[PDB]
Design a protein around this ligand. Structure first.
Ligand SMILES: Nc1ncnc2c1ncn2[C@@H]1O[C@H](COP(=O)(O)OP(=O)(O)O)[C@@H](O)[C@H]1O
Ligand SMILES: [Mg+2]
Ligand SMILES: [Mg+2]
Length: 200
């Protein structure tokens, strides 16, 4: 039977495929926001290449098993990771995959755990983390994910992420001086937005 408020392994794979297709519209905007640590206009391109490599790996895997979906997500994202945002994103996805290992379906409760473990894995991966960044936005999303149904969890996680994103120039002066929010954190918002679109 269908679980209504839970994704099977095939649906989890489709969610990330959907989110990848969603992401491409926002690439040019993310590039133009990129001021930290250097303004070289590539955050959107870097994050998209990371996502696209995860999708290529999922297409080669047996997405009927949750442990194979998790393996493809971590392994693909690492190889395709580009730049600081891509490396961090790949390690966020590795923590997300870790929460999926040993589980048969992704429900609201596991999605909270996955978002929280993703943020911690991304934080541990950076040698010297800085706040006002993708790390701050990813952590807020996991902390603010509430509810039992997927849709409520994604909605509350997204709202907490958008709220943290607006506060990034308050924490990082280079963002305030340039009048932008963090490009990496904005990319993570767009990724959560795509996931909500799949679940809606
Ligand atoms: N030390 C750090 N701590 C937290 N986040 C970081 C750090 N360094 C970079 N980032 C994230 O990476 C984003 C920049 O991504 P990107 O442009 O791909 O990096 P690069 O400088 O390699 O081009 C920033 O907006 C920030 O969110
Ligand atoms: Mg850059
Ligand atoms: Mg660069």
């Amino acid at each position: 039977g269908h679980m209504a408020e839970a994704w099977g392994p095939e649906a989890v794979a489709e969610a990330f495929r959907y989110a990848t297709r969603w992401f491409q519209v926002y690439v040019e905007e993310l590039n133009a926001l990129n001021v930290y640590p250097v303004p070289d206009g590539d955050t959107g391109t870097n994050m998209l290449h990371t996502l696209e490599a995860a999708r290529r790996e999922l297409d080669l895997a047996d997405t009927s098993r949750m442990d194979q979906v998790a393996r493809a997500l971590a392994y693909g994202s690492l190889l395709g990771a580009r730049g600081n945002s891509g490396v961090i994103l790949s390690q966020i996805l590795r923590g997300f995959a870790e929460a999926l290992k040993g589980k048969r379906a992704l429900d609201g409760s596991l999605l909270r755990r996955a978002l929280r473990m993703g943020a911690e894995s991304g934080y541990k991966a950076v040698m010297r983390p800085v706040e006002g960044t993708i790390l701050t936005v990813a952590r807020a999303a996991g902390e603010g994910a509430r509810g039992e149904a997927l849709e409520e969890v994604l909605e509350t996680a997204l709202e907490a992420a958008r709220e943290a994103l607006e506060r990034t120039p308050e924490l990082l002066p280079v963002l305030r001086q340039a009048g932008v929010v963090d490009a990496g954190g904005a990319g993570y918002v767009r990724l959560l937005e795509g996931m909500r679109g799949y679940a809606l």
